[PDB]
Amino acid sequence: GFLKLIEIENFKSYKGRQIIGPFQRFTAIIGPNGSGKSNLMDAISFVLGEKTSNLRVKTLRDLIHGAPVGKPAANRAFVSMVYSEEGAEDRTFARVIVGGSSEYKINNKVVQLHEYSEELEKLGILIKARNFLVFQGAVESIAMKNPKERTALFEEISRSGELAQEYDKRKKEMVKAFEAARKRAKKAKQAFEQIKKERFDRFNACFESVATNIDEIYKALSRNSSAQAFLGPENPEEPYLDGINYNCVAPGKRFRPMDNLSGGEKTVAALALLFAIHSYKPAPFFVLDQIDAALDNTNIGKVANYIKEQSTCNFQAIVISLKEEFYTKAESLIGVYPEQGDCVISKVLTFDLTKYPDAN
Amino acid sequence: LHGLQESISLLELCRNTNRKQAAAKFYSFLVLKKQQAIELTQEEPYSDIIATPGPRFH
Numbered sequence: 001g002f003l004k005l006i007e008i009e010n011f012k013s014y015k016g017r018q019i020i021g022p023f024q025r026f027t028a029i030i031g032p033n034g035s036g037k038s039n040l041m042d043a044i045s046f047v048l049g050e051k052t053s054n055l056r057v058k059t060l061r062d063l064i065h066g067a068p069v070g071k072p073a074a075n076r077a078f079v080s081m082v083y084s085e086e087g088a089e090d091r092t093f094a095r096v097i098v099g100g101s102s103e104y105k106i107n108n109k110v111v112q113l114h115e116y117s118e119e120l121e122k123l124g125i126l127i128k129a130r131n132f133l134v135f136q137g138a139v140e141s142i143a144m145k146n147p148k149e150r151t152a153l154f155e156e157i158s159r160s161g162e163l164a165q166e167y168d169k170r171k172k173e174m175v176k177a178f179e180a181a182r183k184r185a186k187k188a189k190q191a192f193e194q195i196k197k198e199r200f201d202r203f204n205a206c207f208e209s210v211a212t213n214i215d216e217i218y219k220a221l222s223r224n225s226s227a228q229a230f231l232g233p234e235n236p237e238e239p240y241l242d243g244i245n246y247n248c249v250a251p252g253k254r255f256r257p258m259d260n261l262s263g264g265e266k267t268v269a270a271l272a273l274l275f276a277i278h279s280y281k282p283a284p285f286f287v288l289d290q291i292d293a294a295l296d297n298t299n300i301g302k303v304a305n306y307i308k309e310q311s312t313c314n315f316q317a318i319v320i321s322l323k324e325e326f327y328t329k330a331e332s333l334i335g336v337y338p339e340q341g342d343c344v345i346s347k348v349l350t351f352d353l354t355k356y357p358d359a360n
Numbered sequence: 361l362h363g364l365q366e367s368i369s370l371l372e373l374c375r376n377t378n379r380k381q382a383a384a385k386f387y388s389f390l391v392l393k394k395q396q397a398i399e400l401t402q403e404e405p406y407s408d409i410i411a412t413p414g415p416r417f418h
């Protein structure tokens with residue numbers, strides 16, 4: 001279903017208790033730069049259980065409003081989300097900072113992080129994969145990635161890499177490897193091939209799904225049926241050694257690798273690769289931090305319209321945006337504004353866009 | 361702001377506009393509150409947004 005609303009108290013730049021939203025299918029967070037737009041994405045992934053290490057602070061208490069000044073506003077900070085689902089009633093997830101401890105609740109039923117997670121895990125939300133978010137600059141980091149970097153990118157998300165060095169130690173065990181030696185060399189083959197498959201499968205459980213969707217996604221982003229994307233490995237036997245080539249045909253253009261496309265074309269394929277990644281094990285809502293910073297005048301409307309369409313079909317779209325061309329296709333705006341204080345103080349406004357007509 | 365100079369309704373400033381013009385007015389409430397040129401208030405989510413002149417005057 002969808003993230004219905006967000007409630008926060010004293011989280012990062014957001015002082016006091018505020019309601020954020022309620023959210024619709026396509027909602028855009030806007031505001032002046034540096035006022036705490038990203039911090040709102042932190043609050044979401046905080047309440048979905050993110051490790052303190054991945055929320056841009058050193059210690060958990062630093063998440064509490066005012067810690068950057070040495071003046072934390074309280075001993076107690078929290079974020080909660082109301083998840084709405086068709087046929088079910090609303091459930092409430094909340095995460096609370098109490099001194100140095102995190103405390104988690106579901107409809108006030110206190111739980112441990114484990115039970116908190118597996119309940120979010122069955123809604124389609126993987127705090128390990130971070131399937132529900134896209135960090136500022138992700139697109140252009142993708143767009144610059146070479147085939148071996150692309151393989152690496154698949155390896156970490158698929159958890160392929162965890163077994164990658166116990167693979168290296170048993171391949172090292174086999175290169176070095178009178179009949180009592182033939183039988184131990186037989187244990188080498190078994191011990192290696194067992195790891196060759198473990199890693200092979202982890203990689204392919206993930207990569208093969210992305211590869212069949214990327215083309216239909218590249219078509220929809222282009223808004224042109226003459227577009228084609230291709231994702232395949234340089235080592236179909238052992239994909240996690242070589243690279244992942246990425247071939248595209250841009251509309252009214254010739255077939256060629258993604259790297260040789262023009263900047264405007266590179267980013268579109270990079271979005272296609274991105275959405276195809278999140279096409280693997282997809283989240284009910286999708287959170288994009290300033291995806292539109294990479295975009296230029298031509299294709300800004302094309303992805304705004306692709307997201308506008310996916311919001312009523314495939315997932316709730318919660319998008320931080322800095323370009324009026326993108327965020328004016330939203331159903332609603334959450335405008336962030338700053339008050340004056342020792343540190344920055346964020347507060348939100350809510351604007352309905354459906355009350356007004358599209359532009360000429 | 362200049363024409364805007366006693367309290368102001370956002371939903372009235374957006375009478376008869378299209379999306380890009382209303383989003384523009386909204387976005388300008390944010391920047392004016394940032395620039396202290398106004399204060400503002402909103403009762404509940406998606407209600408009218410109301411601006412009274414702010415500590416840095418007109």
Ligand SMILES: Nc1ncnc2c1ncn2[C@@H]1O[C@H](COP(=O)(O)OP(=O)(O)OP(O)(O)=S)[C@@H](O)[C@H]1O
Pocket residue numbers: 011012013014032033034035036037038039040062063064065066067068136343344
């Ligand atoms: N615990 C905290 N208390 C008060 N302020 C904080 C806290 N943690 C972070 N901040 C501040 O939150 C402010 C806004 O941070 P962000 O949300 O990342 O800004 P932003 O709007 O995303 O900026 P961009 O990406 O340049 S447009 C930062 O300047 C921080 O100094």
Ligand SMILES: [Mg+2]
Pocket residue numbers: 037038039136289
């Ligand atoms: Mg940011």
